[PDB]
From Swiss-Prot:
<comment type="similarity">
    <text>Belongs to the RRP7 family.</text>
</comment>
<comment type="subunit">
    <text>Component of the 90S pre-ribosomal particle.</text>
</comment>
<protein>
    <recommendedName>
        <fullName>Ribosomal RNA-processing protein 7</fullName>
    </recommendedName>
</protein>
<comment type="function">
    <text>Plays an important role in the synthesis of 18S rRNA but is not required for the 5.8S and 25S pathway. Is necessary for the cleavage at site A2. Is required for efficient association of RPS27 with the pre-ribosomal particle.</text>
</comment>
Length: 46
């Protein structure tokens, strides 16, 4: 619609603050987690 279209563009086109730091944190966790996992995320033997 014409309304949802405006709020949509204005929403994203605006900027990102909260989601910024949030995503950064998640990424950091993915970094450490990956290091902890070392190898692939699979079970060679179970």
């Amino acid at each position: 619609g014409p309304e949802a279209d405006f709020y949509r563009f204005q929403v994203r086109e605006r900027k990102k603050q909260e989601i910024n730091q949030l995503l950064s944190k998640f990424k950091e966790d993915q970094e450490r987690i990956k290091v902890m996992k070392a190898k692939r995320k699979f079970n060679p033997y179970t």
